[PDB]
Amino acid sequence: VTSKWFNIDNKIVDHFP
Amino acid sequence: AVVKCKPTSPGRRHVVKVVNPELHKGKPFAPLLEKNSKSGGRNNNGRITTRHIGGGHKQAYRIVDFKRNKDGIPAVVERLEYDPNRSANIALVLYKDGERRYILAPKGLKAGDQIQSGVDAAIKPGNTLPMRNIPVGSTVHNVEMKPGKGGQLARSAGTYVQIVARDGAYVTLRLRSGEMRKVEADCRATLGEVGNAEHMLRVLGKAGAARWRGVRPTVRGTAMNPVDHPHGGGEGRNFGKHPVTPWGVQTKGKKTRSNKRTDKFIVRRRS
Amino acid sequence: MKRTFQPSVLKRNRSHGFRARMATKNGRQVLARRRAKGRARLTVSK
RNA sequence: UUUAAUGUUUGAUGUUCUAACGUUGACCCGUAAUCCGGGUUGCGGACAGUGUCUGGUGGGUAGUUUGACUGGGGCGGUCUC
RNA sequence: UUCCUUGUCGGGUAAGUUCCGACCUGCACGAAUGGCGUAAUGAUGGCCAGGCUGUCUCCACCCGAGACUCAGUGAAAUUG
RNA sequence: CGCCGGAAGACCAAGGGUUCCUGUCCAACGUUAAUCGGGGCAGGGUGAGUCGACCCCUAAGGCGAGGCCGAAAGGCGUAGUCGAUGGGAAACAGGUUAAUAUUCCUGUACUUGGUGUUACUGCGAAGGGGGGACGGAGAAGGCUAUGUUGGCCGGGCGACGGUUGUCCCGGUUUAAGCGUGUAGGCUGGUUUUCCAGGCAAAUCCGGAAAAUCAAGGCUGAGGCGUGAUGACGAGGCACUACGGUGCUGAAGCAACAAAUGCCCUGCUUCCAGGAAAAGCCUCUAAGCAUCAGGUAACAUCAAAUCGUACCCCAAACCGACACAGGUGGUCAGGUAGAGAAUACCAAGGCGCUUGAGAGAACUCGGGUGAAGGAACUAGGCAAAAUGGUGCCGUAACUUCGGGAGAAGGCACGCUGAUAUGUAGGUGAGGUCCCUCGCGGAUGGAGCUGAAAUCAGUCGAAGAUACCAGCUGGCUGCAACUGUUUAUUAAAAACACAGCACUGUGCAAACACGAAAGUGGACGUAUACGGUGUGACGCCUGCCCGGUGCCGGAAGGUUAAUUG
RNA sequence: GAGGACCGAACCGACUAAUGUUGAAAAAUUAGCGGAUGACUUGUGGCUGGGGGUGAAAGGCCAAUCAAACCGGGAGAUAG
Ligand SMILES: N[C@@H](Cc1c[nH]c2ccccc12)C(=O)O
Ligand SMILES: [K+]
Ligand SMILES: [K+]
Ligand SMILES: [K+]
Ligand SMILES: [K+]
Ligand SMILES: [K+]
Ligand SMILES: [K+]
Ligand SMILES: [K+]
Ligand SMILES: [K+]
Ligand SMILES: [K+]
Ligand SMILES: [K+]
Ligand SMILES: [K+]
Ligand SMILES: [K+]
Ligand SMILES: [K+]
Ligand SMILES: [K+]
Ligand SMILES: [K+]
Ligand SMILES: [K+]
Ligand SMILES: [K+]
Ligand SMILES: [K+]
Ligand SMILES: [K+]
Ligand SMILES: [K+]
Ligand SMILES: [K+]
Ligand SMILES: [K+]
Ligand SMILES: [K+]
Ligand SMILES: [K+]
Ligand SMILES: [K+]
Ligand SMILES: [K+]
Ligand SMILES: [K+]
Ligand SMILES: [K+]
Ligand SMILES: [K+]
Ligand SMILES: [K+]
Ligand SMILES: [K+]
Ligand SMILES: [K+]
Ligand SMILES: [K+]
Ligand SMILES: [Mg+2]
Ligand SMILES: [Mg+2]
Ligand SMILES: [Mg+2]
Ligand SMILES: [Mg+2]
Ligand SMILES: [Mg+2]
Ligand SMILES: [Mg+2]
Ligand SMILES: [Mg+2]
Ligand SMILES: [Mg+2]
Ligand SMILES: [Mg+2]
Ligand SMILES: [Mg+2]
Ligand SMILES: [Mg+2]
Ligand SMILES: [Mg+2]
Ligand SMILES: [Mg+2]
Ligand SMILES: [Mg+2]
Ligand SMILES: [Mg+2]
Ligand SMILES: [Mg+2]
Ligand SMILES: [Mg+2]
Ligand SMILES: [Mg+2]
Ligand SMILES: [Mg+2]
Ligand SMILES: [Mg+2]
Ligand SMILES: [Mg+2]
Ligand SMILES: [Mg+2]
Ligand SMILES: [Mg+2]
Ligand SMILES: [Mg+2]
Ligand SMILES: [Mg+2]
Ligand SMILES: [Mg+2]
Ligand SMILES: [Mg+2]
Ligand SMILES: [Mg+2]
Ligand SMILES: [Mg+2]
Ligand SMILES: [Mg+2]
Ligand SMILES: [Mg+2]
Ligand SMILES: [Mg+2]
Ligand SMILES: [Mg+2]
Ligand SMILES: [Mg+2]
Ligand SMILES: [Mg+2]
Ligand SMILES: [Mg+2]
Ligand SMILES: [Mg+2]
Ligand SMILES: [Mg+2]
Ligand SMILES: [Mg+2]
Ligand SMILES: [Mg+2]
Ligand SMILES: [Mg+2]
Ligand SMILES: [Mg+2]
Ligand SMILES: [Mg+2]
Ligand SMILES: [Mg+2]
Ligand SMILES: [Mg+2]
Ligand SMILES: [Mg+2]
Ligand SMILES: [Mg+2]
Ligand SMILES: [Mg+2]
Ligand SMILES: [Mg+2]
Ligand SMILES: [Mg+2]
Ligand SMILES: [Mg+2]
Ligand SMILES: [Mg+2]
Ligand SMILES: [Mg+2]
Ligand SMILES: [Mg+2]
Ligand SMILES: [Mg+2]
Ligand SMILES: [Mg+2]
Ligand SMILES: [Mg+2]
Ligand SMILES: [Mg+2]
Ligand SMILES: [Mg+2]
Ligand SMILES: [Mg+2]
Ligand SMILES: [Mg+2]
Ligand SMILES: [Mg+2]
Ligand SMILES: [Mg+2]
Ligand SMILES: [Mg+2]
Ligand SMILES: [Mg+2]
Ligand SMILES: [Mg+2]
Ligand SMILES: [Mg+2]
Ligand SMILES: [Mg+2]
Ligand SMILES: [Mg+2]
Ligand SMILES: [Mg+2]
Ligand SMILES: [Mg+2]
Ligand SMILES: [Mg+2]
Ligand SMILES: [Mg+2]
Ligand SMILES: [Mg+2]
Ligand SMILES: [Mg+2]
Ligand SMILES: [Mg+2]
Ligand SMILES: [Mg+2]
Ligand SMILES: [Mg+2]
């Protein structure tokens, strides 16, 4: 199955650039 | 006659159309029609080999006589017709024996005119003679390159060739591009110019008018990515390189003629 | 919305049928591999 | 050292020629056929074109490289005696 | 496109880092990788006004579907 | 009682494959129970000369004897042969099963072949000609499907004031075929002679000439007659397993309105200039000639095979699900309305496979709100507001088209009169004429029917519900309509008409291919490819030192080769 | 009676907000929104194949996968 969308979403995931 | 359209729409503002009222309003002559289905620019491998070709209006092919080898028999012009396959107009002629043929309509020719091909015809627009029987200096069209092969040069609307000299078995022509070419004197040519000389004065006016002629959009190479075009790429609008074709060959100046077996027939290249 | 499988028996037979496998050398090797494996259905036919 | 003559030619350029070769010119036949082949003829003609060898060009395409130390990496500096 | 910079002057506001007009000191505009204008057009960007309003001052009440209780069926992520 | 009704109704194609109908069972399946079911088990059910496939004919395209090309495998392609989404013969109405019906039954039809008899006779193709055979938009006329009202027929006299009438309810249907040839559309007709054309021939097609006639021919919806002394028919009567079954059966007309359907593959007009082949008609060649063959009438025989149940905007197809998603075509009733929008309804079909209570916070979808009115916020986000027809009126700017529905304003219901229903539309009877019929002129009965003015009247409100633009001022960017990141970006990005440079003389440049070949193009420099810019207006200045490209040939350097 | 003309249903699309986010749905619903005779839209069939196609150009799309598809093999690649 595909992963949870919130784990895909760049805004949520990449929060600490 | 060129007529400007009235700006009742933004797509009508710049339209200029060439309307000829002497054309035949009716169906073409059926026995001289063929099927002519479109390609899309694709060869027998299925691949696009010429870009920006596709769609357009359905067309039928008119079997035009480019040889004009029905010698000795006079023919009267019946009508002028529209041809969707070329820029010039075509005229339907009727021979004395009862045969009908299409020809390229020369300039100034009307319905009822008399034409005649052969070696002993008269020097008037519409008649086809071997170029050894045509005066030096004459304006001809529909010129042959090989005797009996058919006319190939000066076919499209308004074009013509001038006979500059005749020395031996060859005649020197001044082609419409400005090139001086030698052609043997047994090849045929038709007197006069090709009609419809204001075909170039028309303005399509909108983007859909080019799509009615089977012309699809051109994307600029500088607007692509580097994987697509040598010009592709950039953060903003960059260029920074010599202009080339999509296959890396220099455009804008670089000559591409390499034909060593026809260089002897070319007196002077165009300039 | 529209999914990827839109069935059509004519396009199913013209693409993966028996007469279409038997037409090329590579299609006859697909049939030799499936007979060697022992499959109950060689091609997708009637 | 230096030249001219005769005989012979080699290499260069030029001029014609036809018979190899080309023909996406015309006609005839296989043939109920815009493929192909054969025949006649015209136009080119030892050119073009192809093979082997060879110089140039060649991000069109391919395989790769692009150091370490370092009060984080980069930049700067340094690397042996 | 201007870093310094919310440059300076004028307009609009009681008060305007945005907006409009002008100045020229253009860090670092500029003529077909176009310059300057431009009627019409745009689910395009910025600003102002009239109308309108629970957007707000500041929330109140009401009508339905859940949440709550009863009977039947009955999951999930996680977990030394 | 509620919901849909341009569907959530009906019929199919694609796809599925027994889900169809009947009996029986309730373990599992159904988001609960289940006596029920698209679930389990058993039995039954799909009937064709005319519908569809198969069949004949072809398009794009596929395969491809020889052939051309290629280390091999293979690629391309001629003659051919396949390939529908297109062209090609013929059936309708009624009745019937639990479940099929244009297939079964009743009635009435039609098509194509084979054979035989009779009568007459130039038949014959792998060839020639015709035909089939074709675009977009627009306009109008003639019609029908269909609807409404009247008439006619059957029934009724009303749970509560009135209801023997200008009252209420229901019905008023009928096909293909055959005959006639009308509104409309196209076209001159006939005869004779001759001819460098249609690969040969031709009486056919094309061309030329002459004579003569004022008409002929082709096509064509609808109507009318017949089909039909039939069928159907509101109801009524007689039985019943109360599901249903049997018998009989009245009227069955007219006017008006009217399509997006038909005449119409028509007509008018525009440019972007709009399939192929066979069936069909005709001409002849080789050939055959008291043959064979052709034409007409009659009789007779044949028309095989496969599909046919059921669902098909869906619980049966594609989505793992009985999943708020997706899915091509056909049919198209009433009132209001411009309308296939919208509201309420008919035929028809449904209430969405958990319910019962309670009436906390909070969440979701909505209704209303004192005074204020953007003070909210990144930002008037979201809400609120505007909203129709007719008429008056409307600025800067402009490419003279626009801007513009600018802005803003007024009227709007019902009743009566003008006018017992007007202007307009339709048009019976009667009369006259002829061409005696689907004809013309006159005539006006009946039916239908806006819009306006005047007067009166009700409410707070008359575009009363549903439905239905917020408007204005300044400015950046892109000319404009379009296109794009399927699934966080619709934009100032891409495209564009226009402009410029450049390559290309035809076996074109260029592109796909070890090649043959193909596209470019059955085009020919007013054409084609590549690059940049991007409507239009005013314009586009200086630099050739660098890199690139174009031209040059003296000299220097310089490969294989030779030795 | 022209028009890549205007308003607006079918049809094609996807600008804003709210809901949903172990969803009714691995991209939808509701209320608004754009085009709506054209560079339109749609059915059936066909052709182009992986360093290849196609692309009004976003590295977009090529079976819920794309700066190099999927399946099988080299293969137990190599992994300071
Ligand atoms: N959140 C939304 C949209 C979404 C789907 N897939 C995603 C992947 C990444 C981010 C968001 C999404 C949903 O669940 O329907
Ligand atoms: K024909
Ligand atoms: K472009
Ligand atoms: K760029
Ligand atoms: K020769
Ligand atoms: K050579
Ligand atoms: K250190
Ligand atoms: K540190
Ligand atoms: K700047
Ligand atoms: K002020
Ligand atoms: K101020
Ligand atoms: K501009
Ligand atoms: K926009
Ligand atoms: K703007
Ligand atoms: K059970
Ligand atoms: K369920
Ligand atoms: K078909
Ligand atoms: K024939
Ligand atoms: K004739
Ligand atoms: K059936
Ligand atoms: K409660
Ligand atoms: K409106
Ligand atoms: K857009
Ligand atoms: K773009
Ligand atoms: K050019
Ligand atoms: K061609
Ligand atoms: K220079
Ligand atoms: K320079
Ligand atoms: K230079
Ligand atoms: K119009
Ligand atoms: K219209
Ligand atoms: K299509
Ligand atoms: K790949
Ligand atoms: K897949
Ligand atoms: Mg191009
Ligand atoms: Mg261009
Ligand atoms: Mg880009
Ligand atoms: Mg590159
Ligand atoms: Mg830049
Ligand atoms: Mg020679
Ligand atoms: Mg590289
Ligand atoms: Mg390696
Ligand atoms: Mg380091
Ligand atoms: Mg450091
Ligand atoms: Mg100020
Ligand atoms: Mg602010
Ligand atoms: Mg300013
Ligand atoms: Mg700039
Ligand atoms: Mg610059
Ligand atoms: Mg420049
Ligand atoms: Mg400007
Ligand atoms: Mg737009
Ligand atoms: Mg419970
Ligand atoms: Mg568990
Ligand atoms: Mg875990
Ligand atoms: Mg079953
Ligand atoms: Mg059932
Ligand atoms: Mg149960
Ligand atoms: Mg069922
Ligand atoms: Mg069952
Ligand atoms: Mg069962
Ligand atoms: Mg082939
Ligand atoms: Mg081998
Ligand atoms: Mg066939
Ligand atoms: Mg049934
Ligand atoms: Mg024919
Ligand atoms: Mg009728
Ligand atoms: Mg009675
Ligand atoms: Mg009575
Ligand atoms: Mg009473
Ligand atoms: Mg009644
Ligand atoms: Mg044929
Ligand atoms: Mg399914
Ligand atoms: Mg499903
Ligand atoms: Mg599954
Ligand atoms: Mg359900
Ligand atoms: Mg569903
Ligand atoms: Mg649909
Ligand atoms: Mg509706
Ligand atoms: Mg009903
Ligand atoms: Mg209580
Ligand atoms: Mg509540
Ligand atoms: Mg209030
Ligand atoms: Mg108030
Ligand atoms: Mg504020
Ligand atoms: Mg504040
Ligand atoms: Mg809003
Ligand atoms: Mg003003
Ligand atoms: Mg004006
Ligand atoms: Mg105006
Ligand atoms: Mg107005
Ligand atoms: Mg600004
Ligand atoms: Mg734009
Ligand atoms: Mg995306
Ligand atoms: Mg996106
Ligand atoms: Mg978006
Ligand atoms: Mg070009
Ligand atoms: Mg640009
Ligand atoms: Mg300049
Ligand atoms: Mg040079
Ligand atoms: Mg429009
Ligand atoms: Mg899209
Ligand atoms: Mg949306
Ligand atoms: Mg919506
Ligand atoms: Mg709109
Ligand atoms: Mg619209
Ligand atoms: Mg719309
Ligand atoms: Mg178009
Ligand atoms: Mg994908
Ligand atoms: Mg790779
Ligand atoms: Mg491993
Ligand atoms: Mg290995």
Numbering used by the authors:
A (entry chain B5): 8 to 24
B (entry chain BC): 2 to 272
C (entry chain B2): 1 to 46
Which text from the study accompanies this structure?
Free L-tryptophan (L-Trp) stalls ribosomes engaged in the synthesis of TnaC, a leader peptide controlling the expression of the Escherichia coli tryptophanase operon. Transcription initiation of tna is controlled by catabolite repression, while the expression of tnaA and tnaB is regulated via a transcription attenuation mechanism resulting from the tryptophan-dependent stalling of a ribosome producing TnaC, a 24-amino acid leader peptide. In the presence of inducing L-Trp levels, translation termination is inhibited when Pro24 of TnaC is in the ribosomal P-site and the stop codon is in the A-site, causing the ribosome to stall. Our structural data reveal how the ribosome and nascent TnaC co-operate to capture a single molecule of L-Trp and explain the role of various functionally important residues, such as the strictly conserved Trp12 and Asp16 of TnaC, the 23S rRNA base pair A752:U2609 and residue Lys90 of uL22.
In order to understand how the R23F mutation leads to increased tryptophan sensitivity, we prepared E. coli 70S ribosomes stalled during translation of tnaC(R23F) in the presence of L-Trp and analyzed their structure using cryo-EM. A major subpopulation (~53% of particles) corresponding to ribosomal complexes with TnaC(R23F)–tRNAPro in the ribosomal P-site could be identified, resulting in a structure with an overall resolution of 2.4 Å, referred to as TnaC(R23F)–70S. Clear density in the region of the nascent polypeptide exit tunnel between the PTC and the constriction formed by ribosomal proteins uL4 and uL22 allowed us to unambiguously model the backbone and side chains of residues 9–24 of TnaC(R23F). On the other hand, the density corresponding to residues 1–8 was weak to nonexistent, consistent with the negligible impact of TnaC N-terminal deletions on ribosome stalling and previous reports indicating that the nature of the N-terminal residues of TnaC is not important for translational arrest. In the stalled TnaC(R23F)–70S and TnaC–70S termination complexes, the C-terminal half of TnaC folds into a compact structure consisting of two short consecutive α-helical segments—α1 (residues 11–15) and α2 (residues 17–21)—connected by a ~110° hinge centered on the side chain of Ile19. In addition to the TnaC peptide, we observed clear density for a single L-Trp molecule near the tunnel constriction. The indole side chain of L-Trp makes contact with both the ribosome and the nascent peptide, and is wedged between the base pair formed by residues A752 and U2609 of the 23S rRNA, and residues Trp12, Ile15, and Asp16 belonging to helix α1 of TnaC. In this work, we identified and characterized a TnaC variant with a single R23F mutation that undergoes translational arrest at much lower L-Trp concentrations than the wild-type TnaC.
